[PDB]
Design a protein around this ligand. Structure first.
Ligand SMILES: *[C@@H]1O[C@H](CO)[C@@H](O[C@@H]2O[C@H](CO)[C@@H](O[C@@H]3O[C@H](CO[C@H]4O[C@H](CO)[C@@H](O)[C@H](O)[C@@H]4O)[C@@H](O)[C@H](O[C@H]4O[C@H](CO)[C@@H](O)[C@H](O)[C@@H]4O)[C@@H]3O)[C@H](O)[C@H]2NC(C)=O)[C@H](O)[C@H]1NC(C)=O
Ligand SMILES: *[C@@H]1O[C@H](CO)[C@@H](O[C@@H]2O[C@H](CO)[C@@H](O[C@@H]3O[C@H](CO[C@H]4O[C@H](CO)[C@@H](O)[C@H](O)[C@@H]4O)[C@@H](O)[C@H](O[C@H]4O[C@H](CO)[C@@H](O)[C@H](O)[C@@H]4O)[C@@H]3O)[C@H](O)[C@H]2NC(C)=O)[C@H](O)[C@H]1NC(C)=O
Ligand SMILES: *[C@@H]1O[C@H](CO)[C@@H](O[C@@H]2O[C@H](CO)[C@@H](O[C@@H]3O[C@H](CO)[C@@H](O)[C@H](O)[C@@H]3O)[C@H](O)[C@H]2NC(C)=O)[C@H](O)[C@H]1NC(C)=O
Ligand SMILES: *[C@@H]1O[C@H](CO)[C@@H](O)[C@H](O)[C@H]1NC(C)=O
Ligand SMILES: *[C@@H]1O[C@H](CO)[C@@H](O)[C@H](O)[C@H]1NC(C)=O
Ligand SMILES: *[C@@H]1O[C@H](CO)[C@@H](O)[C@H](O)[C@H]1NC(C)=O
Ligand SMILES: *[C@@H]1O[C@H](CO)[C@@H](O)[C@H](O)[C@H]1NC(C)=O
Ligand SMILES: *[C@@H]1O[C@H](CO)[C@@H](O)[C@H](O)[C@H]1NC(C)=O
Lengths: 107, 91, 115, 292, 91, 292, 91, 292, 107, 115, 115, 107
C-alpha cells in the first residue's frame, strides 16, 4: 500500500491567475494516472487520462504531464465552468489509493 | 494519345509516392519503419489476436475508427513540441 | 450515444440485503469491464471491487468480502451484499471501470440511507 | 497501457483505377508507341486470404477497349502487348478452376507484378485466337444482366479456313457435351433442354445484325450463315470463344438472340484480373512509448 | 490539348512541393514546424512589433535581406557538423 | 541575443502563373475532357490585409480565352465549368462594392479555394448570359488604355427574342439613368453629356465591323441594326454586358467607336479574381538556440 | 508532340530526384551529407590513396562490389533497431 | 577498423539518355512551343579526368533529327534554339583541337550547364550556315563505317548566290590544301593521291541521287551540277560543311560516291557533346562509427 | 599483457534452450573481436566478426554484441549443426591472448 | 572461389629443421596479409607470428625468435625454423591472418610428430 | 557603404572643456545605438558610457559622472565633459556600440594631449 | 564585477603553426562575447562575434567556439596579415571587463 499527498482542499483565487493541482506518487507508477471532475449532485466526466491524453470537451485549459516520480496538473486560466471537486486515480496495483478531494470555492 | 497515357501513369506514381509520405512525416516519424506514439489505443477490448489474424482483414475492421485516431496526431505533435521552446529560454 | 439510467429502493434499514440495479442500453454487458463505486457524503471515492464481463478475469478487493454477479438476462447487472454496515452506507454510482480508452460513462446514482 | 504504433510496409490493399504502362516484345508498332521494354516474368505467388473478383466492372478491361479502338482508328486516318503495374500496385488472379466471372470467395488467389499476353482482334459473332484456350469448359454469367460469353475447349479446335467461307466445322460430338453443361451451368432456369434447341438468328431489319463482320488483312466480309443452321490472300482462324445473349419467353421454347458486340471479346481475355492499390500504412497497439 | 493541360498542373504541384522542401531540409530542419538556428538576427533594431504586425506585410519588408541570411546557412551546417567527425576519432 | 528562427505554415503569398484543374457538373463534354469531379463549395473567409487586384493583366483570364477557343475549334474539325487550385494555391476576390477593375486598396478581400460558375459565349456587340448580373451598375476603366466594358443591371432584363431579330428592347428609362452614372464614373473628362449623345457605328469598309456576329445553335447571323439607333429553331437571350471603346475628338461632340472583340467578354466574368502562390516559409528572430 | 517533350523531361527529374533519395533514407541516413555506418569495409587492402585519387575513377573500380555492400544495409538497419523495442519493455 | 561511410554530392557520373528542355531567344515559334526562357550563359569550367566521346552514337543528336523533322512537318500540314539540362544533369565538351569524332582520351574536357547555339537547315549535298566555322580544318571518320563529313574553314567563305545557281565558288587554292590534309588525316589507306582525284557523281537511276535538293524560302530546286566538275525572291548561302561517303575499289583510282543524307548535317553541329547523369552517391571507408 | 576469462568448457543443454558464451575483455579493446568454430579434425570457419557483423552461412542464430568492457554472445536456439569448439580472438595489441576452448557435448 | 591445398613431411625427429609448405592458388601472395598458426592437441590457439606480403610491414612476436620468408617464386610460401622443441610440436595450419574483411580461408593442415 | 569622418582640436590644456565631434553620413543617428570609447596609449580599451538614439533607453556607467547629448541637428553628435583629468587623456574613438549585428564601423579618431 | 584572464601578451611563432588565444570567463556569460583586431594607428575591424558567427573577410582561419564557462579561439594557420593586438569583449552585465591586449610580434 502507498499514500498519496494531495493539494490543499481550500483555494482562494482571482480571475486571470494560474491554478496548479498536484497529487504526488509514492513510486514510479509509470503514468497510469487518471482525472475526473464531479459537479455537486451530478456524475463525474473525464477531462484528462493517462497523464497526457487530451479528451474532447476543453481545448487547452486542462493539460497534465509528468512521469516517474514527479506529476503535476497545470491550468492556464480559471473560468466559471471549472468548479466542484477534483480527484486523481491510479490503478497500477491492486490496492487503490485515492485523494482527499478539493472543495473548490471561487471568489 | 498514347504519349499522354504513359505520362499519366508516371506522374500518378510520384503523386501517390509523396502523398502517403506527406500524410506520414507530419505525425513525427519521417521514414522509420516502426515507431511508437504517445496516443493511447482506444477500446483496449479490441486487442487483435496476434496468433490468428492478418493485416488485410483487421485494417478494414477498424476503417470507421481510422478517421478519429489520425486527427489526434495533429494536436499531439504541435502541443508537446511547442512547450520545449519556452523551457530552454531561462537556461 | 448512450442513455444510462438506473433506479433503486432508497430506503434500507440496517442489517438487510442491499439491492441496487443499473440498466445498460445500447451496449453489451459482456466484453466490457464494469465496476461499482460509492460516494460517501463526506469521504472521497473508494474502490470496492471489479468485475469483467468477458468472464476470463475475476479480481476483487480482499477487504470487503463482497461478490457481484454478471447475469446477462436482458443486458442488466446488479450488486449483491448482505448485512449492510452503518459505515458502508453511501451514494452508489454505476459505471464502467476507468481504463485507457476514450469511452467512459457514469450514472447519477441514488442515495442509500439507514436509521 | 498499449499505445498506438505505426507500421510501414505491412500488406494491405484496396480497389484502384489508374492507367498502366506498356510491355511488349515486337517493335515497330506505331513508332514504338513510347512503350517500355518487356521483362520475361510470369511468376506468381500463393495467397490465402480471399479477394473480390469481377469481369464486367473491372477498370483494367475498360482501358483496353478504348486503347485497341484508338490504334485501329490510326489505320483509317496484330500485336501482343502487356500491362505491368508500377511500384505500389499489383494485379490479382483467381486460380480457382470454377471461375465464371463472379468469384467473391476465391479459395486460392495469386499476386503477379504483370498480366499475361493478350491478343487484339476486331471481329463479331466469333471468338478469334484468344488466350484462355484450356481443357475446361465454362461460361460466364452476369448477375445484373444475363449477357453470357462462352469459352471453347482446345480439343475440338473448330478448324476454319477462309479465302477470297467454306467449312464443315460442326463437331457434332463437341456441341452435344458443351450444351449439356450449360444446363449444368451454376444457374439455368426452366427450359429443360431435352433434345430441342435452335440458334435463332436476330430478326430482320438493320443490315448489321443480318450479316456478320470479319477482318482478314483488311476485308469487310459480309456473307450468309443460313446453310449450316438451317495472288489471292488467304487466312485461317482458330475459334476460341463466342458472344451470346441468352433470352427466353416461355418454358416450352427458347430463342437465342445472340449479340454482336466487339468489346466483350477483350473482356474475356482479362476477365480474371483486377488492379489493387497497396497501402503500406498500418496501425497497431503496443506497450512502447516515445522518449519525452 | 486538354490532356496536357491537366498533366501540366499536377507535375507543377509536385515540382513546387519538393522545391521548398528541397530548400528546406538542407539548412538542418527537415519537417519540424518551428526550430531554432545558431545564426544571429542582423539589425536587432528591426525587431518586429509582435502585437500590431502581420506575416504578409513584414515578409516583403525584409525581401532585400532574405538573399543574404539564407547563404550563411550553408557555411553554418557543414562547418559545425564536419568538426564532430574528428572529435570522436581519439575516443 | 535573438537568433534566427524558421517558421513553417505562416500565411504569406505572392503573384503566380500556372494552369488550373477542371471542375464541372455536367458530363459528356468531349469525352469528359479528363476533368475532375466538382465539389459544391462556395465558402469564403474574411481577410483584413489589402491586396492588389487587376482584370486585364491577370493570368487567370488569359487561359480561359485560349481554352474556350480551342473547344470551339473541335466543332469545326454551352458548358459551365470551374477552376479549383491545387494545394499551396488560392484565389482572391475583392468584395468591395466599388470595384471597377483597378482596386489596389481593397478594403475587404476574401480567399476561396475555387472560383465561381462561368458561362462561355462566342458573341460580339452584346453581353450574353454572364454571371455578374446584380443590382449595382458600374463600368470598368483601363488605366493604360481608355478601354472599357459596361455591366448591365438585372432589373431591366433587356428582353431579346430571335427567330429564323424583332425586339423593342429599348428601356428608355433604363438608359437615361445608366449614362448619367458614366458621367459620375470615377473619371469622365470633358464632354459634359448634357442631353446630347449618339451611338455612332464604326465607319464603313471591312465587312466585319459593318455587321455583328451572333450564334444561335450554329448560325452565322449578319443583320442590320440601323433601325433602332437612327421546324424552325428558336432561341432567346438575356443581355448582361456590352463591349465598347470610348473615344472623343472634341469637347462639343463625342463618337463611340464601339469594339467587337470577343475575348473581353470572358475577362469580365473572371475580372475580380487573381491567382496567388502561397509561400509557407517564414523567418523570425527568437532568443532560443540549438543544442550544440 | 512538343508538349509531351517538355512534360517528359520534368517528371523524369522528380522521378530521379526521389529514387536516389528513396535508395537513400532507407539505410538510416535521410539527408545528412556525411554519416557513418556500422558495416566494416571489406578488403582493407583496397584502401584508396587519398592524396592521388579521384572520386570518378575509384567509383568504377568498385562497381562489381557495389551490389554486395548495399544489400547488407537492409539486415543491419532492421535487426539492430528491432531489438531496442523489447529492451524498454521491462523498464 | 575502417567502417563504410556514405558521401553525398561527390562528383560522379555515367552515361544517360533523356529528353532536354527548351532554350531560345526568338518568340512566335509555333505558339512559343511551351519553351522556357533562355539564359545568356556560355561559361565553361576546366576538368582534368578524361571522358569517352562520340558523335554517331550519342543520344543528344538523335532527338534533334526527330525534333527538326517534326517541326517541318507542321508546315506541310529558320530558328536558333538550345538545350539546357535540368539539375543533376550536365553536358561535356572536348576542347582538344584534334577532335575527329572519336576522342576516347580527351586531354582537356569542360563541363557546361547548356549547349551552344545551333542552326537547322534541311539541305542536301552542301553544308549551310553551321556553327563550327573555324580556322582549323579536320574531317570526322567513323570506326564502324568509312562515312565521313568534312568541315570547311571560314577563310575561303565559298561565296554562293542563288536566284530565280550562278557561281564560280571554286577557290582552287583552297581545295588544293584541304585534300592534302585528307591524306594526312589520321587514317588514309592506299590511294596515294598524287595529283589525281575526281568527284564522280552517283551513277544514274533514281531521280533523287541524280539531282540535289536545296530550299530557298520554300523552293524545291532541282538543277544540274555537271558544268563545274566536268518581285523575285533572292537568297544567299555561306557553305560550312559537306557530306561524303568515301569508297575505293583499287589503289590506282578512287571514286567518291557522295551521300545525300540530311540527318548527318545536324550531327556535326552537336558532334562534340554528350549527356551524362550525375550520381551524387559515394561510399568511402572511415574509422568512424555510429553511436549504438 | 592481459588475461581473458572464458565461459566453462563443459556444457549440458537441451533442445529449444538459449546458450550464452562469453569471454570478458580486460579493458576497452574497442570491439576488435572475432569468432571462429572448428569442427573435430577440420578447419575453422568464420561466423561473426568485428563483434556485430553478420557473415554468410547462418541467418540469425549467431549474433554477438557488446562494446567497451562488456561483451556477450547470444544464440537464440541450439541445432545439431552447432557443435565442436568455440574461440574468440582479439588483435588490438601485439601480444594476443586466447581462450581455453569449449568442448561442447550436446545431449 | 579458392581451393587451398598443402602438404608436408609428417615425420620430424627432435632437433631437425622444420619445413612445411602451403600452396596458394587463384590469388597473389603479395598484397595479402598471411600468418601461421598451429593447433596443439590439448591446448588452444596460440599466436606465433605475422608477415605481410606487401613487404612494407614486418611484425613478429619477440618470444619465439622465428622468421618466415615471403619468396614469391610461383605463388608459394613456407615456414622456416631450426632446432624444433618438444613443446613446439603441434598441428600446423596455414591461413591468412584474421582481419575485418569478409574473406578468410584456412587449410586443413597436417600433424607434426616427434619421438 | 559608409564613409565615417571626424575632426577635433587636438590640443587641450588641463582643466578645460573637452569637445570632440564625429560626423555621421549616409545613416540616421536616431534608431542606432552609439557609444564613445577611448584608447589609452598604454592601457587597453575601457568602457566609459552608452547612449541610444531612440531616446527610450539611457544607460551610463556610475563611475565617471559624464553625460553625452544626442542632438540631431544635421545628423551629428559630440561628447561633453568638463575639468579633464590627466589620467583621462587618451586617443578618442567614435563608433557604434558593439552588438550582435553584422554592421559595425569605427572612426580613426584623433589624439588628445595635455601639458 | 568580474576579472578576465587573458593569454600572454608576448608570443613567438613560426609559419605553419597553430596559434591559440583565450580569455577565460568568470561565470556563465552565455556566449555574449565579441572579438576585434586593431592595427597600429588604425581602427579595429570585427572578425568573429557572438562566439561562433563568421563575419565576411576571412574564410576559415578565424573561428571561435565555446559556451558556458569554457571559451577558446583557434587559428589553423598564421599569415602575414594577422598582426597587431587582440581583444575580447563581453557585455552581459553593466560593468564591462576588458583584456590586457596581446602585443604580437612575428618572427
Ligand atoms: C469497443 O470494443 C467492444 C469489444 O470489442 C465492442 O463491443 C461490441 O459492441 C457491439 C455493439 O453493437 C455488440 O453488438 C451487440 O451484440 C449484442 C449481443 O450479441 C451477442 O449476443 C450473445 C451474448 O452472449 C452472443 O452469444 C452472440 O453470439 C452475439 O455475439 C446484440 O444484442 C446487440 O444488438 C442490440 O442492438 C440492436 C440494434 O443495433 C437491437 O435491435 C438489439 O435488440 C440489441 O438491443 C449488438 O448487436 C458486440 O456484441 C460487442 N462485442 C462483444 C465481444 O461483446 C464495442 O462495440 C466497441 N466500441 C465501443 C465500446 O464504443
Ligand atoms: C582484395 O584486394 C586485393 C588487393 O587490392 C586484391 O588483390 C589482387 O588480386 C588479383 C587477383 O586476380 C591479382 O591479380 C593477379 O596478379 C598476379 C600477378 O600480378 C602482378 O605480378 C607481379 C608480382 O610482383 C607484378 O610485378 C605485376 O606487375 C603484376 O601486378 C597474376 O599472376 C594473376 O594472374 C593469375 O590468374 C590468371 C587467370 O586469371 C592466370 O592465367 C595466371 O597464370 C595467374 O595464375 C592475377 O592477374 C592482383 O595482383 C592483386 N593485387 C595486388 C596488389 O597484388 C584482391 O583481388 C581483392 N579481392 C579479394 C581478396 O577477394
Ligand atoms: C576550350 O577550348 C579552347 C580551345 O578552343 C581553350 O582555349 C584556350 O583557353 C586558354 C584559357 O586558359 C588560353 O590560355 C591563354 O593563353 C594565353 C597565351 O599567352 C595567356 O596569355 C592567357 O592568359 C591564357 O592563359 C588558350 O590560349 C586558349 N587556346 C585557344 C587555342 O583558344 C579553352 O581553354 C578550353 N576551355 C577550358 C575551360 O580550358
Ligand atoms: C483463428 O482465429 C480465431 C479468431 O476468431 C481464434 O478464435 C482461433 O483460435 C484461431 N485458430 C484456429 C481457427 O485454428
Ligand atoms: C436473367 O435473364 C433474364 C432473361 O430475360 C432477365 O429477364 C432477368 O432480368 C435476368 N436476371 C438476372 C438476375 O440476371
Ligand atoms: C499598430 O502598429 C503600429 C506600428 O507602426 C503601432 O505603432 C501601433 O501602436 C499599433 N496599434 C494601433 C495602430 O492601434
Ligand atoms: C599518383 O597516384 C599513384 C597511384 O597509383 C601514386 O603511386 C603516385 O605516387 C601519385 N603521384 C604522382 C603520380 O605524382
Ligand atoms: C573502308 O575502307 C577500308 C580500307 O581497307 C576497309 O578496310 C573498310 O572495311 C572500309 N569500310 C567500309 C565502310 O566499307
Amino acid at each position: 500500500d502507498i499514500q498519496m499527498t494531495q493539494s490543499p482542499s481550500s483555494l482562494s483565487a482571482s480571475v486571470g491567475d494560474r491554478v496548479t493541482i498536484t497529487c504526488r506518487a509514492s513510486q514510479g507508477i509509470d503514468n497510469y494516472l487518471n482525472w475526473y471532475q464531479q459537479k455537486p449532485g451530478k456524475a463525474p466526466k473525464r477531462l484528462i487520462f493517462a497523464a497526457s491524453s487530451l479528451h474532447n470537451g476543453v481545448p487547452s485549459r486542462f493539460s497534465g504531464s509528468g512521469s516517474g516520480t514527479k506529476f503535476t496538473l497545470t491550468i492556464s486560466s480559471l473560468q466559471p465552468e471549472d468548479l466542484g471537486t477534483y480527484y486523481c486515480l491510479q490503478y497500477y496495483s491492486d490496492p487503490y489509493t485515492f485523494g482527499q478531494g478539493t472543495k473548490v470555492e471561487i471568489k | 494519345v498514347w504519349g499522354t497515357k504513359n505520362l499519366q501513369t508516371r506522374v500518378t506514381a510520384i503523386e501517390k509516392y509523396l502523398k502517403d509520405q506527406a500524410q506520414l512525416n507530419s505525425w513525427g516519424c519521417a521514414f522509420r519503419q516502426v515507431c511508437c506514439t504517445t496516443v493511447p489505443w482506444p477500446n483496449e477490448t479490441l486487442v487483435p489476436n496476434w496468433s490468428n489474424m492478418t493485416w488485410q482483414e483487421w485494417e478494414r475492421q477498424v476503417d470507421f475508427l481510422e478517421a478519429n485516431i489520425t486527427q489526434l496526431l495533429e494536436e499531439a505533435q504541435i502541443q508537446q513540441e511547442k512547450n520545449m521552446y519556452e523551457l530552454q529560454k531561462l537556461n | 450515444q448512450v442513455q444510462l439510467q438506473e433506479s433503486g429502493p432508497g430506503l434500507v434499514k440496517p442489517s438487510e440485503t442491499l439491492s441496487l440495479t443499473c440498466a445498460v442500453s445500447g451496449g453489451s454487458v459482456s466484453g466490457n469491464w464494469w465496476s461499482w463505486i460509492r460516494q460517501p457524503p463526506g469521504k472521497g471515492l473508494e474502490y470496492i471491487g471489479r468485475i469483467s464481463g468477458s468472464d476470463g478475469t475475476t479480481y476483487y478487493r480482499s477487504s470487503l468480502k463482497v461478490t457481484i454477479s454478471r447475469d446477462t438476462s436482458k443486458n442488466q447487472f446488479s450488486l449483491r451484499l448482505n448485512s449492510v454496515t452503518a459505515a458502508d452506507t453511501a451514494v452508489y454510482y454505476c459505471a464502467r471501470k476507468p481504463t485507457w480508452d476514450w469511452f467512459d460513462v457514469w450514472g447519477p446514482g441514488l442515495l442509500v440511507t439507514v436509521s | 497501457i498499449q499505445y498506438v504504433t505505426v507500421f510501414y510496409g505491412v500488406p494491405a490493399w484496396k480497389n484502384a483505377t489508374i492507367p498502366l504502362f506498356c510491355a511488349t516484345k515486337n517493335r515497330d508498332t506505331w513508332g514504338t508507341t513510347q512503350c517500355l521494354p518487356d521483362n520475361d516474368d510470369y511468376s506468381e505467388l500463393a495467397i490465402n486470404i480471399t479477394e473480390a473478383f469481377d469481369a464486367w466492372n473491372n477498370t483494367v478491361t475498360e482501358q483496353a477497349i478504348e486503347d485497341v479502338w484508338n490504334l485501329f482508328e490510326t489505320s483509317i486516318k496484330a500485336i501482343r502487348f502487356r500491362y505491368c503495374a508500377p511500384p505500389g500496385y499489383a494485379l490479382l488472379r483467381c486460380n480457382d478452376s470454377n471461375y465464371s466471372g463472379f468469384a467473391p470467395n476465391c479459395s486460392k488467389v495469386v499476386v503477379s507484378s504483370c498480366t499475361r499476353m493478350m491478343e487484339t482482334q476486331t471481329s463479331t459473332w466469333f471468338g478469334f485466337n484468344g488466350t484462355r484456350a484450356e481443357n475446361r469448359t465454362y461460361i460466364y454469367w452476369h448477375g445484373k444482366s444475363n449477357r453470357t460469353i462462352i469459352s471453347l475447349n482446345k480439343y475440338y479446335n473448330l478448324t476454319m479456313r477462309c479465302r477470297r467461307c467454306w467449312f464443315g466445322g460442326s463437331w457434332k460430338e463437341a456441341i452435344q457435351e458443351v450444351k449439356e453443361t450449360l444446363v449444368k451451368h451454376p444457374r439455368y432456369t426452366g427450359t429443360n433442354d431435352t433434345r430441342k434447341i435452335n440458334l435463332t438468328a436476330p430478326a430482320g431489319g438493320d443490315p448489321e445484325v443480318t450479316f456478320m463482320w470479319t477482318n482478314c488483312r483488311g476485308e469487310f466480309l459480309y456473307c450468309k450463315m443460313n446453310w449450316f443452321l438451317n495472288g489471292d490472300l488467304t487466312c485461317n482462324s482458330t475459334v476460341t470463344s463466342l458472344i451470346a445473349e441468352i433470352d427466353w419467353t416461355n418454358n416450352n421454347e427458347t430463342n437465342i438472340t445472340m449479340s454482336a458486340e466487339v468489346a466483350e471479346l477483350y473482356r474475356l481475355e482479362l476477365g480474371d484480373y483486377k488492379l489493387v492499390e497497396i497501402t503500406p500504412i498500418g496501425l497497431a497497439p503496443t506497450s512502447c512509448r516515445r522518449y519525452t
